[PDB]
Design a protein around this ligand. Sequence first.
Ligand SMILES: CCC(=O)N[C@@H](CCCCN)C(=O)N[C@@H](CCCCN)C(=O)NCCCCCNC(=N)N
Lengths: 39, 154
Amino acid sequence: DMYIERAGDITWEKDAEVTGNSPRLDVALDESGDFSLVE
Amino acid sequence: ETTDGVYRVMTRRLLGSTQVGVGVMQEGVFHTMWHVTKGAALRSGEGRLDPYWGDVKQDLVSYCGPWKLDAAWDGLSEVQLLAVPPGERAKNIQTLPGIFKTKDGDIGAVALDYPAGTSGSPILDKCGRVIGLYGNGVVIKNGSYVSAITQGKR
Ligand SMILES: CCC(=O)N[C@@H](CCCCN)C(=O)N[C@@H](CCCCN)C(=O)NCCCCCNC(=N)N
């Protein structure tokens, strides 16, 4: 049995850390809602 | 509590209190990813939230009402993941999305790696609107994780 707990407002943070790259990927989505790489 | 904002999804079925995911309360509707709750009812204090709409292929579910989030990534600008990791304070991570290319179109994707219980954390644009939820993705040749920016239909 699950319950929810508030964790914050949804707001843009002006001085957020910036990280992560921007890969362009060929993917497929199956009926189960799973993405797979197409190569 | 029904205030707008981001919420942890917790269970006490396993050892201690376990965070299984995250979601978004907006306009009286709770939004999370299907794989977090598997469509099951939720407790909010002394109140009960019943599922209203869900779709396994989209990996989304809404409670108390229809899906309300309709902002979309603009394809150009940096976004922020509002990551809510298990046992850790909410924190904003800014990134430039990549792209999932599919036979049915392209969607934004964020190459950020967080614990499984972070599933459902919102991704926001510079106006603070939720453009999708984090936690359904793929593992790249490098072993890294990339999450679709998963958005429903309003
Ligand atoms: C933990 C393994 C993993 O990355 N699974 C992928 C799916 C790959 C499918 C390949 N066909 C995934 O997206 N999981 C989802 C649940 C399944 C959703 C099903 N619709 C999940 O736990 N997301 C939360 C973040 C997990 C980050 C994992 N990071 C690494 N693997 N380095």
